[PDB]
Motif scaffolding. Structure first.
Motif, PDB file in Angstrom:
ATOM      1  N   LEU B  18       0.817  -1.197   0.022  1.00 40.57           N
ATOM      2  CA  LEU B  18      -0.031   0.046  -0.118  1.00 40.57           C
ATOM      3  C   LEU B  18       0.867   1.211   0.122  1.00 40.57           C
ATOM      4  O   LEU B  18       0.585   2.244  -0.476  1.00 40.57           O
ATOM      5  N   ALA B  19       1.892   1.162   0.768  1.00 38.74           N
ATOM      6  CA  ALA B  19       2.880   2.197   0.621  1.00 38.74           C
ATOM      7  C   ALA B  19       3.503   2.504  -0.698  1.00 38.74           C
ATOM      8  O   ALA B  19       3.585   3.649  -1.076  1.00 38.74           O
ATOM      9  N   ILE B  20       3.804   1.392  -1.196  1.00 36.99           N
ATOM     10  CA  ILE B  20       4.219   1.566  -2.809  1.00 36.99           C
ATOM     11  C   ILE B  20       3.252   2.193  -3.649  1.00 36.99           C
ATOM     12  O   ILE B  20       3.481   2.800  -4.745  1.00 36.99           O
ATOM     13  N   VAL B  21       1.891   1.951  -3.490  1.00 40.77           N
ATOM     14  CA  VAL B  21       0.943   2.354  -4.066  1.00 40.77           C
ATOM     15  C   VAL B  21       0.668   3.768  -4.198  1.00 40.77           C
ATOM     16  O   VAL B  21       0.416   4.411  -4.950  1.00 40.77           O
ATOM     17  N   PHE B  22       0.919   4.294  -3.003  1.00 46.09           N
ATOM     18  CA  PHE B  22       0.797   5.613  -2.386  1.00 46.09           C
ATOM     19  C   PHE B  22       1.954   6.523  -3.201  1.00 46.09           C
ATOM     20  O   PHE B  22       1.876   7.486  -3.484  1.00 46.09           O
ATOM     21  N   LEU B  23       3.144   5.867  -3.166  1.00 46.75           N
ATOM     22  CA  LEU B  23       4.115   6.520  -3.711  1.00 46.75           C
ATOM     23  C   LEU B  23       4.129   6.709  -5.072  1.00 46.75           C
ATOM     24  O   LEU B  23       4.439   7.685  -5.785  1.00 46.75           O
ATOM     25  N   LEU B  24       3.588   5.596  -5.870  1.00 48.44           N
ATOM     26  CA  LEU B  24       3.278   5.681  -7.314  1.00 48.44           C
ATOM     27  C   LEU B  24       2.293   6.634  -7.673  1.00 48.44           C
ATOM     28  O   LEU B  24       2.545   7.314  -8.424  1.00 48.44           O
ATOM     29  N   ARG B  25       1.282   6.689  -6.856  1.00 48.31           N
ATOM     30  CA  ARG B  25       0.094   7.475  -7.047  1.00 48.31           C
ATOM     31  C   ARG B  25       0.406   8.942  -6.591  1.00 48.31           C
ATOM     32  O   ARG B  25       0.844   9.823  -7.626  1.00 48.31           O
TER      33      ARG B  25
ATOM     34  N   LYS C   4      -7.862 -18.797   6.630  1.00 46.14           N
ATOM     35  CA  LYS C   4      -8.533 -17.669   5.955  1.00 46.14           C
ATOM     36  C   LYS C   4      -8.192 -16.428   6.028  1.00 46.14           C
ATOM     37  O   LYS C   4      -8.287 -15.630   5.147  1.00 46.14           O
ATOM     38  N   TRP C   5      -7.458 -15.860   7.275  1.00 49.38           N
ATOM     39  CA  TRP C   5      -6.870 -14.545   7.201  1.00 49.38           C
ATOM     40  C   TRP C   5      -5.934 -14.544   6.172  1.00 49.38           C
ATOM     41  O   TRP C   5      -5.479 -13.644   5.605  1.00 49.38           O
ATOM     42  N   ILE C   6      -4.959 -15.757   6.220  1.00 49.78           N
ATOM     43  CA  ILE C   6      -3.883 -15.843   5.208  1.00 49.78           C
ATOM     44  C   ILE C   6      -4.361 -15.581   3.438  1.00 49.78           C
ATOM     45  O   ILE C   6      -3.841 -14.823   2.762  1.00 49.78           O
ATOM     46  N   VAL C   7      -5.293 -16.303   3.466  1.00 48.52           N
ATOM     47  CA  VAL C   7      -6.229 -16.127   2.194  1.00 48.52           C
ATOM     48  C   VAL C   7      -6.842 -14.706   1.805  1.00 48.52           C
ATOM     49  O   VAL C   7      -6.224 -14.234   0.866  1.00 48.52           O
ATOM     50  N   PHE C   8      -7.299 -14.061   3.085  1.00 45.38           N
ATOM     51  CA  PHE C   8      -7.602 -12.784   2.617  1.00 45.38           C
ATOM     52  C   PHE C   8      -6.569 -11.759   2.399  1.00 45.38           C
ATOM     53  O   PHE C   8      -6.466 -10.907   1.464  1.00 45.38           O
ATOM     54  N   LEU C   9      -5.433 -12.154   3.212  1.00 46.44           N
ATOM     55  CA  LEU C   9      -4.132 -10.953   3.065  1.00 46.44           C
ATOM     56  C   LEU C   9      -3.465 -11.050   1.814  1.00 46.44           C
ATOM     57  O   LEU C   9      -3.159 -10.374   0.959  1.00 46.44           O
ATOM     58  N   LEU C  10      -3.704 -12.509   1.143  1.00 49.46           N
ATOM     59  CA  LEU C  10      -3.013 -12.627  -0.097  1.00 49.46           C
ATOM     60  C   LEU C  10      -4.240 -12.199  -1.159  1.00 49.46           C
ATOM     61  O   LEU C  10      -3.383 -11.787  -2.142  1.00 49.46           O
ATOM     62  N   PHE C  11      -5.322 -12.344  -1.023  1.00 48.25           N
ATOM     63  CA  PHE C  11      -6.171 -11.481  -1.951  1.00 48.25           C
ATOM     64  C   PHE C  11      -5.855 -10.130  -1.946  1.00 48.25           C
ATOM     65  O   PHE C  11      -5.839  -9.468  -3.072  1.00 48.25           O
ATOM     66  N   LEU C  12      -5.611  -9.499  -0.821  1.00 49.97           N
ATOM     67  CA  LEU C  12      -5.435  -8.191  -0.760  1.00 49.97           C
ATOM     68  C   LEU C  12      -4.186  -7.771  -1.485  1.00 49.97           C
ATOM     69  O   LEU C  12      -3.956  -6.723  -2.081  1.00 49.97           O
ATOM     70  N   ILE C  13      -2.965  -8.706  -1.102  1.00 49.29           N
ATOM     71  CA  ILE C  13      -1.823  -8.393  -1.783  1.00 49.29           C
ATOM     72  C   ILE C  13      -2.047  -8.571  -3.491  1.00 49.29           C
ATOM     73  O   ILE C  13      -1.354  -7.764  -4.305  1.00 49.29           O
ATOM     74  N   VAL C  14      -2.683  -9.463  -3.865  1.00 50.99           N
ATOM     75  CA  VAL C  14      -3.078  -9.314  -5.505  1.00 50.99           C
ATOM     76  C   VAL C  14      -3.597  -8.300  -5.812  1.00 50.99           C
ATOM     77  O   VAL C  14      -3.428  -7.703  -7.028  1.00 50.99           O
ATOM     78  N   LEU C  15      -4.743  -7.792  -5.089  1.00 47.22           N
ATOM     79  CA  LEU C  15      -5.200  -6.415  -5.747  1.00 47.22           C
ATOM     80  C   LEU C  15      -4.309  -5.264  -5.790  1.00 47.22           C
ATOM     81  O   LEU C  15      -4.559  -4.413  -6.316  1.00 47.22           O
ATOM     82  N   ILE C  20      -0.761  -1.713  -8.371  1.00 47.22           N
ATOM     83  CA  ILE C  20       0.794  -1.291  -9.021  1.00 47.22           C
ATOM     84  C   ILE C  20       0.938  -1.299 -10.466  1.00 47.22           C
ATOM     85  O   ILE C  20       1.390  -0.606 -11.112  1.00 47.22           O
ATOM     86  N   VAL C  21       0.295  -2.408 -11.086  1.00 48.20           N
ATOM     87  CA  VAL C  21       0.376  -2.632 -12.509  1.00 48.20           C
ATOM     88  C   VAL C  21      -0.317  -1.590 -13.198  1.00 48.20           C
ATOM     89  O   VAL C  21       0.141  -1.187 -14.351  1.00 48.20           O
ATOM     90  N   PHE C  22      -1.644  -1.449 -12.791  1.00 50.22           N
ATOM     91  CA  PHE C  22      -2.190  -0.372 -13.405  1.00 50.22           C
ATOM     92  C   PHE C  22      -1.619   1.073 -13.472  1.00 50.22           C
ATOM     93  O   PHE C  22      -1.627   1.752 -14.360  1.00 50.22           O
ATOM     94  N   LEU C  23      -1.029   1.402 -12.032  1.00 44.83           N
ATOM     95  CA  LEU C  23      -0.170   2.858 -11.883  1.00 44.83           C
ATOM     96  C   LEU C  23       0.790   2.599 -12.831  1.00 44.83           C
ATOM     97  O   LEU C  23       1.267   3.698 -13.556  1.00 44.83           O
ATOM     98  N   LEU C  24       1.598   1.458 -13.256  1.00 37.19           N
ATOM     99  CA  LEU C  24       2.732   1.444 -13.987  1.00 37.19           C
ATOM    100  C   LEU C  24       2.448   1.515 -15.533  1.00 37.19           C
ATOM    101  O   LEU C  24       3.140   2.033 -16.353  1.00 37.19           O
ATOM    102  N   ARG C  25       1.289   1.145 -15.818  1.00 37.01           N
ATOM    103  CA  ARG C  25       0.740   0.982 -17.231  1.00 37.01           C
ATOM    104  C   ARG C  25       0.280   2.342 -17.727  1.00 37.01           C
ATOM    105  O   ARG C  25       0.672   3.362 -17.053  1.00 37.01           O
TER     106      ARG C  25
END
Ligand SMILES: CCCCCCCCOCCOCCOCCOCCO
Ligand SMILES: CCCCCCCCOCCOCCOCCOCCO
Lengths: 25, 25, 25, 26, 25
Positions: B18-25, C4-15, C20-25
């Motif tokens: 999230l910090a990286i996202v805010f730094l890029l944004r 379940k919390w690990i899966v939730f955090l990994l989903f957040l990481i994917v998001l 990041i990919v959108f901001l870089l594109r």
């Protein structure tokens, strides 16, 4: 142990992400 | 147990990304 | 649970990585 | 199960990081 | 083995973040 492997790899990932955060700024 | 460490490090990773996202944004 | 919390955090990481990919594109 | 969900998410993370690498390299 | 897959994918993530840091520097 597999969970210890996971913890160590995640710690390495945390270190690398910190490095990236400080490389951006 | 190491599930707690795994969750803690994943939380740190979410914060750093999230910090990286805010730094890029 | 912890899984379940690990899966939730990994989903957040994917998001966040998609952000990041959108901001870089 | 949840382990397969975790594997799918980690594989998507690997793919996204590969996309970031391929974007930064050229 | 699922845990083996997890460890290997996290190792690939470590490698990819290393590559990202090397490209950022
Ligand atoms: C950067 C935030 C600190 C949170 C990390 C706590 C757990 C990390 O484990 C540290 C391991 O350091 C020594 C490695 O031990 C050998 C492998 O076992
Ligand atoms: C964007 C939603 C895609 C969901 C991934 C499919 C996961 C199905 O397999 C999980 C294990 O069963």
């Amino acid at each position: 142990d597999s969970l210890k492997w996971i913890v160590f790899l995640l710690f390495l990932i945390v270190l690398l992400l910190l490095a990236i955060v400080f490389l951006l700024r």
